[PDB]
XYZ file of N, CA and C in Angstrom:
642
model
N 0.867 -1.171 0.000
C 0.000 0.000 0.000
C 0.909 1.229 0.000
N 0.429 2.022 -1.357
C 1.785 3.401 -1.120
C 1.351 4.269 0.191
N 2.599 4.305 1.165
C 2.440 5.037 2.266
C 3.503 6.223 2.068
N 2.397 7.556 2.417
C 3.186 8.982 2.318
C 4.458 8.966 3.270
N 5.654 9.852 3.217
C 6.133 9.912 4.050
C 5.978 10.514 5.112
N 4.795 11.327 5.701
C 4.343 12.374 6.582
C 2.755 12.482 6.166
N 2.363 12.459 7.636
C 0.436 12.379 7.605
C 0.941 13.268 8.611
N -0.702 14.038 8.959
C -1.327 14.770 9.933
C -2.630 14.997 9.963
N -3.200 13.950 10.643
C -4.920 14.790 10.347
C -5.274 15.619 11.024
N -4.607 16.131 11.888
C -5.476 17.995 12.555
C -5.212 18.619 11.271
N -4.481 18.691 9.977
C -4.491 19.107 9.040
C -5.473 19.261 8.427
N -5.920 17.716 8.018
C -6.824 17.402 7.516
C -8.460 17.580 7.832
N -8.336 18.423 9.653
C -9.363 18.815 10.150
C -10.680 17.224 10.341
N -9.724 16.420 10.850
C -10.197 15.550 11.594
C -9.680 15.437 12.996
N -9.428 16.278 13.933
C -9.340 16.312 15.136
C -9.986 17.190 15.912
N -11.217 17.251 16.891
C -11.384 18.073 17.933
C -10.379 18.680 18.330
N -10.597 19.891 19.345
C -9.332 20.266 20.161
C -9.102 19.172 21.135
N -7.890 19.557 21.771
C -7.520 18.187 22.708
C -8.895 18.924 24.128
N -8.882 17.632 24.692
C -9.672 17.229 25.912
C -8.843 17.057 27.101
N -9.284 17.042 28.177
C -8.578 16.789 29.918
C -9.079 15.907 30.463
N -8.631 14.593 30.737
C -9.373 13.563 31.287
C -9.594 13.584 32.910
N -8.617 14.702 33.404
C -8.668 15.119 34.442
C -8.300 13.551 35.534
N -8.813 13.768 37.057
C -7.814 12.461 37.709
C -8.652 11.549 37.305
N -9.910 10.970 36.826
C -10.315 9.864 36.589
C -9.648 8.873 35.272
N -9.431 7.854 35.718
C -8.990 6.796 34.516
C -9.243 6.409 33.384
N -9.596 7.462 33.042
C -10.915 6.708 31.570
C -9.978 7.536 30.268
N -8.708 6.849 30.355
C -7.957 7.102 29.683
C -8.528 5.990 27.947
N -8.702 5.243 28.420
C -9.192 3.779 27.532
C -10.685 4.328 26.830
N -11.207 5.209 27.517
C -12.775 6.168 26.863
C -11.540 7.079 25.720
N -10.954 8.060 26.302
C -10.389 9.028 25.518
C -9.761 8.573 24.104
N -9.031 7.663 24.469
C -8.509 6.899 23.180
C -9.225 5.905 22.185
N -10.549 5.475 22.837
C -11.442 4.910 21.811
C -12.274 6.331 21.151
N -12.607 7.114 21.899
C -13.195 8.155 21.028
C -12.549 9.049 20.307
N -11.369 9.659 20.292
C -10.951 10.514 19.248
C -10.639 9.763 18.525
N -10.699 8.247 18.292
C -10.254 7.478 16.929
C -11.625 7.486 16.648
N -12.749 7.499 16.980
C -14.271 7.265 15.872
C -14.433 8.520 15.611
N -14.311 9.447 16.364
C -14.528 11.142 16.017
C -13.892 11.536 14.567
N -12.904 11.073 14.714
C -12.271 11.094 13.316
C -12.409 10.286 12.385
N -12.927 8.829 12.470
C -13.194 8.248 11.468
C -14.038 8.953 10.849
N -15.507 9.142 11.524
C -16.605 9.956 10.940
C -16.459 10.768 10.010
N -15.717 11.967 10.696
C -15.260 12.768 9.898
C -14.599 12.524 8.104
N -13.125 11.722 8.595
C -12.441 11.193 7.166
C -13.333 10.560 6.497
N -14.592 9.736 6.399
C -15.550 9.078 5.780
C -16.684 9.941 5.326
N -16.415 11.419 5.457
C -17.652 12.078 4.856
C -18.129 12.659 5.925
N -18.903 12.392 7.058
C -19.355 13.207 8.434
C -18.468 14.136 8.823
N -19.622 14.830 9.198
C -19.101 16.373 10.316
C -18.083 16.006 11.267
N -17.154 16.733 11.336
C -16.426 16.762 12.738
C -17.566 17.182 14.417
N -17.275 16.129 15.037
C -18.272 16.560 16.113
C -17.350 15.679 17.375
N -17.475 16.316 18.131
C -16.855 15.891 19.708
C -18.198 15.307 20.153
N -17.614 14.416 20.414
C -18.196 13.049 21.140
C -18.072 12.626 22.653
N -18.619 11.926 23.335
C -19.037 11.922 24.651
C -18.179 10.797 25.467
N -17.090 11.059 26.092
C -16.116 9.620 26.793
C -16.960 9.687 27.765
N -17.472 10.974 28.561
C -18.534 10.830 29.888
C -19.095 9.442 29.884
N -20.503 8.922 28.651
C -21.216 8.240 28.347
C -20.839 6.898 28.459
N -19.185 6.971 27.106
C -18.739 6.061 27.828
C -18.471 4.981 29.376
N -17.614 6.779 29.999
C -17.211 5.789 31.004
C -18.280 5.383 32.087
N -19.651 5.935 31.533
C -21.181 5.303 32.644
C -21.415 4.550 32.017
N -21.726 4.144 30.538
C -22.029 3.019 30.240
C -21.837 1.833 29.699
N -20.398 1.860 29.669
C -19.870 0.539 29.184
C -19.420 -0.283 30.196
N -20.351 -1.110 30.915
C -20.491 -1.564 31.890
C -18.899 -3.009 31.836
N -17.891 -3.516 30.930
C -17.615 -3.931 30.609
C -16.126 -3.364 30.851
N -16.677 -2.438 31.123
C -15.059 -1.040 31.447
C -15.580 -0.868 33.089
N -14.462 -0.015 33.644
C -14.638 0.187 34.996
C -15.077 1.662 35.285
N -15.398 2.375 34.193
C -15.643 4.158 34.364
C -14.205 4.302 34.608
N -13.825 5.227 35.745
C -12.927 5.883 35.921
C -11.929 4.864 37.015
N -12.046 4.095 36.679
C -11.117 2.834 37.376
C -10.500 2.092 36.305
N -10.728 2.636 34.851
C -9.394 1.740 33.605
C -10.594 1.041 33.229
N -10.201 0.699 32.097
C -11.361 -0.172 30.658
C -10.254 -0.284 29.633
N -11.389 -0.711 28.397
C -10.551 -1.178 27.317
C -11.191 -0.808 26.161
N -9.975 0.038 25.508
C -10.817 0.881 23.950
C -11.577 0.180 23.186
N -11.250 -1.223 23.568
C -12.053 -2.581 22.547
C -13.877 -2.093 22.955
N -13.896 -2.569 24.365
C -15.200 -2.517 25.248
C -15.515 -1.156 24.637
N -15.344 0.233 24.975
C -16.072 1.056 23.742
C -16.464 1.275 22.883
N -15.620 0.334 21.644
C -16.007 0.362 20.544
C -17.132 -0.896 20.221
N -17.305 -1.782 21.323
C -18.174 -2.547 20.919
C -19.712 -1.712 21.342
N -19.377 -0.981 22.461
C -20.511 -0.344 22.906
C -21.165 0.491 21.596
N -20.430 1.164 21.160
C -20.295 1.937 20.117
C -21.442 1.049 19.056
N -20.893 0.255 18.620
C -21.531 -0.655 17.573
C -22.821 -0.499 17.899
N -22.859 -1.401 19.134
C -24.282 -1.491 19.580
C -25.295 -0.608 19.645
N -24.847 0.533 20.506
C -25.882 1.130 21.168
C -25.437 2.560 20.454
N -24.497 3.029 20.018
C -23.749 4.301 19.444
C -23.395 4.801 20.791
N -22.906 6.594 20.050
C -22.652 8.027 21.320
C -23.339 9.199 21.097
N -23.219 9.973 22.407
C -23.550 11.100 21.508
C -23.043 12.165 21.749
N -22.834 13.335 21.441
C -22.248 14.425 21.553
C -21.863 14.829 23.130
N -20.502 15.474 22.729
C -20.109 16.012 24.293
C -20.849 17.436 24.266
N -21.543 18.067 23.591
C -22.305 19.135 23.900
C -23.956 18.163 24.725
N -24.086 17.556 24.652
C -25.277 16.954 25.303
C -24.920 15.945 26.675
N -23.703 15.565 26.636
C -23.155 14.642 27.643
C -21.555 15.197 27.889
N -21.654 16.082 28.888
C -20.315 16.368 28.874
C -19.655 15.393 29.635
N -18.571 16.399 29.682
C -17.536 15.260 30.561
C -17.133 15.945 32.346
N -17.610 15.062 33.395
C -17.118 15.782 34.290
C -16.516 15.044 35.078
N -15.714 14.049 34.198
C -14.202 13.145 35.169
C -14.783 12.413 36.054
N -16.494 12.057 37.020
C -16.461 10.981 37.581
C -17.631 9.986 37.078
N -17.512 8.767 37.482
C -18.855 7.846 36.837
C -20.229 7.873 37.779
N -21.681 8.084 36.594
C -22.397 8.506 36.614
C -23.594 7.361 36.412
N -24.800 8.121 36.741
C -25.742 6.622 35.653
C -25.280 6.959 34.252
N -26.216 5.771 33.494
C -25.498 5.968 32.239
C -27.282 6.883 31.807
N -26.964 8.062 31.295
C -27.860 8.840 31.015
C -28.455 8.749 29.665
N -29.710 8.985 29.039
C -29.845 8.687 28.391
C -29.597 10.423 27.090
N -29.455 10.356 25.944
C -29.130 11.304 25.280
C -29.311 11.135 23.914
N -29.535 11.754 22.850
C -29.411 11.648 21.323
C -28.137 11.135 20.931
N -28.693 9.847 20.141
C -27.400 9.068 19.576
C -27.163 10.162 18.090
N -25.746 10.421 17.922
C -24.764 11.123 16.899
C -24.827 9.911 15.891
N -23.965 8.459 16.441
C -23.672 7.695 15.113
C -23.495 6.298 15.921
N -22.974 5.486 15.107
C -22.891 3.905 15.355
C -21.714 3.762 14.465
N -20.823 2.984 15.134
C -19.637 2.230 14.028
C -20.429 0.619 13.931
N -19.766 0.482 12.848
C -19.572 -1.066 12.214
C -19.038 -2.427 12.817
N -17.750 -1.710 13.780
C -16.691 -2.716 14.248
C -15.620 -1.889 14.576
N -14.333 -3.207 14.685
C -12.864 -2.594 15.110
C -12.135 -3.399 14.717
N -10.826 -3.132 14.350
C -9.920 -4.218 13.905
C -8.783 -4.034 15.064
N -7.840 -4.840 15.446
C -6.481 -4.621 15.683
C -5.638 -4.506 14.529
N -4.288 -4.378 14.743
C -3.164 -4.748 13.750
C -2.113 -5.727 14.283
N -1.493 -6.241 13.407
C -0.413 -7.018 14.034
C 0.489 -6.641 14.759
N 0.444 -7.123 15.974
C 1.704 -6.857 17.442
C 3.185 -6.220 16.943
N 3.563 -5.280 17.422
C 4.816 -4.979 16.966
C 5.207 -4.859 15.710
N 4.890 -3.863 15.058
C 4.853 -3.929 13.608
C 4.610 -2.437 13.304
N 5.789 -1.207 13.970
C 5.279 -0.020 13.061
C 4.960 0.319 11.741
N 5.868 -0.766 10.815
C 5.259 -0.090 9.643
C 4.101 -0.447 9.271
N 3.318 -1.543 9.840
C 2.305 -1.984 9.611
C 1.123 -0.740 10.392
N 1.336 -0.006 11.750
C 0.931 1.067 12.101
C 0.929 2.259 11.228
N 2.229 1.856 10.697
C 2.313 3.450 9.809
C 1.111 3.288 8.763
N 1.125 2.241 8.094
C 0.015 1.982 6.850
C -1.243 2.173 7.430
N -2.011 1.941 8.431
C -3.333 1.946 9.011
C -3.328 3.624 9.583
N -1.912 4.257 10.240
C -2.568 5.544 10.183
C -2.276 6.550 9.440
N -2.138 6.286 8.329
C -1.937 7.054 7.221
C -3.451 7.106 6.288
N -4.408 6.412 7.404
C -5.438 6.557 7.016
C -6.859 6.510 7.827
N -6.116 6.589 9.101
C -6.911 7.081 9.950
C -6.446 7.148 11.269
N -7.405 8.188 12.388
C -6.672 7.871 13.540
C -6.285 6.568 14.326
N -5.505 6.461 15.021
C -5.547 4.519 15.659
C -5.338 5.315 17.098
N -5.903 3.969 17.532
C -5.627 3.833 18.742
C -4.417 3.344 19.359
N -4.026 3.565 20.373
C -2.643 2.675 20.813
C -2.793 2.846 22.853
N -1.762 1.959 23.011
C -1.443 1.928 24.036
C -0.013 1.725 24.702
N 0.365 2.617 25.223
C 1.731 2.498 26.110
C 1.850 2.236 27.401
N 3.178 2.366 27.883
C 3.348 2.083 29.051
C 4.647 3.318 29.246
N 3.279 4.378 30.503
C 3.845 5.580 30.899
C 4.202 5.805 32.047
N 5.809 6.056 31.881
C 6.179 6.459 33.730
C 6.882 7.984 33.974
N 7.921 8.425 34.657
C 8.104 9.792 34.724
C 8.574 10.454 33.835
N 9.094 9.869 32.703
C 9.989 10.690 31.628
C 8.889 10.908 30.507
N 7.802 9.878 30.119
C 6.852 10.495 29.309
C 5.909 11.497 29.786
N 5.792 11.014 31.606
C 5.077 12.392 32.306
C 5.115 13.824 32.059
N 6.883 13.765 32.174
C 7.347 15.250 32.184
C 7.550 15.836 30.514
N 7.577 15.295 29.920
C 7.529 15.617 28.651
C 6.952 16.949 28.154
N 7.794 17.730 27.778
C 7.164 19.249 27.337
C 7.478 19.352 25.708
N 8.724 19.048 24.930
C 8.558 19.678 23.370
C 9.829 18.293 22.995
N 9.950 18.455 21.649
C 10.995 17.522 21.070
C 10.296 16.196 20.696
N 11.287 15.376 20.054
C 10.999 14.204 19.718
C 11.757 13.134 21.054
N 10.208 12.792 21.707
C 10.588 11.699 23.218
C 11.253 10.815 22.753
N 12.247 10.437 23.718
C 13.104 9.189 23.562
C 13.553 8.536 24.614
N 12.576 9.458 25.756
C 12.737 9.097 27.357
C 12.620 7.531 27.556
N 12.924 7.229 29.102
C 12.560 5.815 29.398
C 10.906 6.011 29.442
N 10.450 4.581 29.660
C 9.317 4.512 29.897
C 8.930 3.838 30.648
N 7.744 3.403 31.663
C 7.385 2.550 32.612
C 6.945 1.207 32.146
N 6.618 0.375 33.112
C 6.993 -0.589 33.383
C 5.756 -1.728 32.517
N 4.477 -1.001 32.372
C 3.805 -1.720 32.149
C 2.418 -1.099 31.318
N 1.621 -1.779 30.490
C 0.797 -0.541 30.150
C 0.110 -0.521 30.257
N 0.123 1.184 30.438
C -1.266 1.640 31.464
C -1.708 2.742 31.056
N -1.681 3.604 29.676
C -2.155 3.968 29.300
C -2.950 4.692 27.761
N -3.820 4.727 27.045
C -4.448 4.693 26.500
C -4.225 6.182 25.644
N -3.582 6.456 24.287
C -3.668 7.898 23.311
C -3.787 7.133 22.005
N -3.363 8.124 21.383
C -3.795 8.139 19.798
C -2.701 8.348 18.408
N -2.457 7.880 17.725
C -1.733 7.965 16.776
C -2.263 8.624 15.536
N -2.181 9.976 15.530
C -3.070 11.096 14.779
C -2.079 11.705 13.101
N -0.324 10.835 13.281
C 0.158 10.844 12.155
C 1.204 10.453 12.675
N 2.707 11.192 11.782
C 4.121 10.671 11.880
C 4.371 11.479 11.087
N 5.962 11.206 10.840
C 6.769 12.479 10.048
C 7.947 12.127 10.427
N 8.868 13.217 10.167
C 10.459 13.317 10.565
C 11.068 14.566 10.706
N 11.962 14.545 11.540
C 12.321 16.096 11.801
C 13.831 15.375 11.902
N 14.984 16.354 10.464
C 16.416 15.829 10.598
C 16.467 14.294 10.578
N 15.556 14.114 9.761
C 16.092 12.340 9.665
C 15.510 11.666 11.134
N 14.984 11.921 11.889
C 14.763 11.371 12.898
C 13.360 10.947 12.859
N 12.981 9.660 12.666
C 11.066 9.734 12.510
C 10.862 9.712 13.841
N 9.266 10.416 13.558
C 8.300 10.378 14.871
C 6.731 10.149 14.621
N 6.131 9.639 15.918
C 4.610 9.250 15.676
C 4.619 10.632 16.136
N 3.299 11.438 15.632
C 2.643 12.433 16.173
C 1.097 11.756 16.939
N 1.809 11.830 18.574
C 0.405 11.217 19.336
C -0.265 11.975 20.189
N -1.810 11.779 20.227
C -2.500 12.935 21.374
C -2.418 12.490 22.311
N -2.634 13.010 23.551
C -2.873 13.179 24.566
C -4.443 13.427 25.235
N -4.554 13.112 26.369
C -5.786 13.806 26.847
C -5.397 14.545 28.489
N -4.494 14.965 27.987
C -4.345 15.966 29.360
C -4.164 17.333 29.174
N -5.091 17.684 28.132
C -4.909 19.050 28.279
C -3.941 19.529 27.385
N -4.521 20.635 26.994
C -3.329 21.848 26.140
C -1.874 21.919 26.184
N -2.222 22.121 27.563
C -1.013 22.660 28.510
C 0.353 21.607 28.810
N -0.425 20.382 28.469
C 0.996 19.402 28.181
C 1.554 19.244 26.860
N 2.997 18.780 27.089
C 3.575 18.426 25.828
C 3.653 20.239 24.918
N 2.995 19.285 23.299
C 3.233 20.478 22.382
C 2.337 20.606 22.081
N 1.127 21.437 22.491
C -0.001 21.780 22.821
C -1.047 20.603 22.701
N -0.565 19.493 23.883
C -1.565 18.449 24.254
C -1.338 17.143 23.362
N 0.265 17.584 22.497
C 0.848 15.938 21.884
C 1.810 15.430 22.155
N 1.886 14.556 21.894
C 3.956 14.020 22.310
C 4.243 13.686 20.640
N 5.231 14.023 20.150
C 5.880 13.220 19.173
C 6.887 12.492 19.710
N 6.868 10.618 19.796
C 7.457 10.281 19.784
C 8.361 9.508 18.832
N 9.346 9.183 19.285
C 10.412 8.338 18.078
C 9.798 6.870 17.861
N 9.757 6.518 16.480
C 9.629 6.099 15.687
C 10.674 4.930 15.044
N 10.114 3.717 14.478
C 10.749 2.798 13.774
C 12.261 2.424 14.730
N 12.080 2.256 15.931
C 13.429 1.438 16.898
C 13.748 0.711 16.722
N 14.786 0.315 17.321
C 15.021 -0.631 17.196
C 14.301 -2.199 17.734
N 13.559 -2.050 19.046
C 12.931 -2.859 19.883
C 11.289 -2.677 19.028
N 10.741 -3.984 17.932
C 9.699 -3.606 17.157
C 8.630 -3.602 18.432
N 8.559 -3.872 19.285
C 7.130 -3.170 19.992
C 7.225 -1.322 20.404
N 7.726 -0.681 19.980
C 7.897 0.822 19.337
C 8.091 1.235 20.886
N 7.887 2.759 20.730
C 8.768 3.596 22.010
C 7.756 3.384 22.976
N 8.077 2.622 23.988
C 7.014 2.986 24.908
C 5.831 1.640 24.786
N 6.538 0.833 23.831
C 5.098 -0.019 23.379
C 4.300 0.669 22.214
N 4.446 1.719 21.873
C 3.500 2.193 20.923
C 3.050 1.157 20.147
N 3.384 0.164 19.473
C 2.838 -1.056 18.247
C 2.473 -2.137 18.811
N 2.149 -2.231 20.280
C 1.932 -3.385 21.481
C 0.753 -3.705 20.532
N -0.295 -2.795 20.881
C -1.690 -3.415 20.534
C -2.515 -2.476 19.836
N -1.904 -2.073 18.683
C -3.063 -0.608 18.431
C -4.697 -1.202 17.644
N -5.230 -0.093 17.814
C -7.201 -0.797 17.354
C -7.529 0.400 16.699
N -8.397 -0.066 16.015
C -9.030 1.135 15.176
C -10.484 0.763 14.750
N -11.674 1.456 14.957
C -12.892 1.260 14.466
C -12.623 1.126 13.346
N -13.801 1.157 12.327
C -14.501 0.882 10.998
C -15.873 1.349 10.890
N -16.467 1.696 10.273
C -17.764 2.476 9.922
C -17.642 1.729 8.372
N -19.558 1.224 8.256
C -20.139 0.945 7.222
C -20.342 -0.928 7.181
């Protein structure tokens, strides 16, 4: 599959602004929804911010704000859909699951094969993915540059793979965050890319997922 050398979809105006998941855990909500927010979008639909709140009350299959799994959202998703964070905001703790106007429904979700950036690179060069790392104090503190910090021990948490690129020969994933603006480079990390160790920086290529619509 010809893959560009450099994607970005906030370019492409498939990204909300970034979000604050604030202290609750529903890191695993954040990262299943800005990957369908954007599918929508790249497939023809409006850009519209979508509801992790909803999520983390009703995907009974997840723990709310005690950790879940982007899978368990997206099946919720299928099923039952979401709906807008203007109708269900987000206020960081778990709730009943309220009822609200469904926005949309996905199709499904795929994984990709374990450890395999370039196989990541090909899937998000065409849409957002999901991923998961394993974050300890050096990805914490992270403010600008291409990360190459250590990383923790195990994974535990849940962003997004929104493109890649290179700066001086050096590749990097361009990944969101959900902590806010105010971290990183205004709420992303670019990390390094194509290592040597194929489960990527941090784990990035551990287990990434991505909906499907249609």
């Amino acid at each position: 599959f010809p893959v560009p050398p450099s994607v970005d979809w906030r370019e492409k105006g498939a990204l909300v602004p970034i979000k604050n998941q604030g202290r609750c855990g529903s890191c695993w909500a954040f990262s299943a929804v800005a990957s369908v927010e954007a599918l929508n979008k790249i497939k023809g639909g409006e850009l519209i911010s979508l509801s992790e709140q909803m999520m983390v009350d009703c995907v009974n299959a997840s723990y709310g704000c005690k950790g879940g799994r982007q899978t368990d959202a997206f099946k919720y998703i299928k099923v039952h859909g979401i709906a807008s964070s203007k109708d269900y905001p987000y206020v960081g703790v778990q709730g009943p699951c309220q009822p609200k106007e469904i926005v949309l429904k996905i199709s499904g979700y795929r994984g990709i094969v374990r450890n395999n950036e370039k196989y990541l690179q090909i899937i998000a060069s065409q849409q957002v993915v999901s991923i998961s790392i394993k974050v300890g104090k050096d990805f914490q503190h992270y403010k600008s540059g291409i990360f190459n910090g250590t990383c923790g021990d195990k994974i535990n948490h849940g962003v997004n793979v929104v493109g890649y690129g290179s700066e001086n020969g050096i590749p990097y994933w361009i990944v969101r965050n959900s902590w806010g603006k105010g971290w990183g480079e205004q709420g992303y990390i670019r990390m390094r890319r194509n290592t040597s160790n194929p489960a990527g920086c941090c784990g990035v290529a551990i287990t990434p997922t991505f909906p499907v619509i249609d």
